[PDB]
């Protein structure tokens, strides 16, 4: 049920500004956790978190031309499924 | 005044008590926020009331308002069973609170 | 043993009540500090004993120890009034509290 | 509190300290105000947690005589402490 509609608002060879749909006020969580990594097979992803009131997030320091997978998780598995996208910088 | 502060503190006691369960693992924002706020208010007002009122009376009346409002809200908004036992207990609680305020 | 940690949570309830009294409206550091830590001990110790035990009996005994010890340590430490009317209405309030919690 | 010293000082900032007492005299927060000893304005004021017995006033004009005071939460303690000092 949350979050919804993960998409890259803006993009640069090194950075991606992404956003999602937090849902209705009763669905808003206390924080989301975001995970970005090389879509290949190197498991040391990079991870950070974002306050539940924020619906956007910027992601700097990406190698130009690479294709990354980007995942947004709610605090618990209760609320829904984590959503993810692919993007080549 | 200190008694009015006590009443309001018990009110906020029950508000944060219900908002806590309406939050999940402290993970629903709007409930959690209300819990955090209602707590901070409640206890603060308690700390104020305890300045002028005895700690036993203050704690007891604060707890009692919390519980009485918890049962009122449970019945009204949660389809809770209303016993005659519960009615006599609510009556005892209100009698104690009123008599304690009347013996000031 | 879960009963014993419930007893100890009820004791820490009285602990932070007395410390809140000593904090003069949350202004004297250390009482305030005793009030805050002794709080989340009691709140934590409870949730553990509440795991094993029925929530009703657990809450009844928890707030019973809390309020009764508050009244007693109040008439002791702070020479709070020991009237027949006060003890009577305190008995009524505490029995109402304990009953409403033993039901729900 | 007592013993309001100016520990260190630069042209644009002061480091101040005070004696909290011990154990039972301690408070949960002190309130530090400061301003030009004369010239009206308002005064600036901030608040520090009561476990720290030091504070740092910053962003001052060099060469000016300021006055600094430290308050306990209420007047039921040890009275407000005050000093003057030129940067």
Numbering used by the authors:
A (entry chain C): 4 to 92
B (entry chain B), C (entry chain A): 1 to 104
D (entry chain D): 6 to 92
Sentences from the paper on this structure:
Upon optimization, we obtained crystals of Gdx-Clo in complex with one of the monobodies, termed Clo-L10, that diffracted to 3.5 Å Bragg spacing, and we solved the structure with phases determined by single-wavelength anomalous diffraction (SAD) of selenomethionine-substituted samples. The asymmetric unit contains one Gdx-Clo dimer and two Clo-L10 monobodies, one bound to each subunit. The monobodies primarily use residues diversified in the library to bind to residues 24−32 from loop 1 of each Gdx-Clo subunit in slightly different orientations, each forming a ~400 Å2 interface. A large aqueous chamber is open to one side of the membrane, with the strictly conserved substrate- and proton-binding glutamates, E13A and E13B, accessible at the bottom. Positive density is visible between the E13 sidechains, but cannot be definitively assigned as Gdm+ at this resolution. Comparing subunit A and subunit B, the domains possess near structural identity (RMSD 0.5 Å for Cα 1−62), but are offset by a rigid body rotation of about 30°. Inspection of the regions that change in accessibility during the transport cycle shows that, for each TM3, only one of the two GxxxAxxxG packing motifs is buried at one time, and that burial alternates with conformational exchange. On the open side of the transporter, several charged amino acids, K21A from loop 1A and E80A and R86A from loop 3A, are solvent-exposed in the aqueous chamber. Upon conformational exchange, K21A, E80A, and R86A, converge on loop 2B and the N-terminal end of helix 3B, forming cross-subunit H-bond interactions with the backbone and sidechain atoms of L53B-T57B. The hydrophobic loop 1A also contributes to sealing the binding pocket on the closed side of the transporter, where it is wedged between the antiparallel helices 2B and 2A.
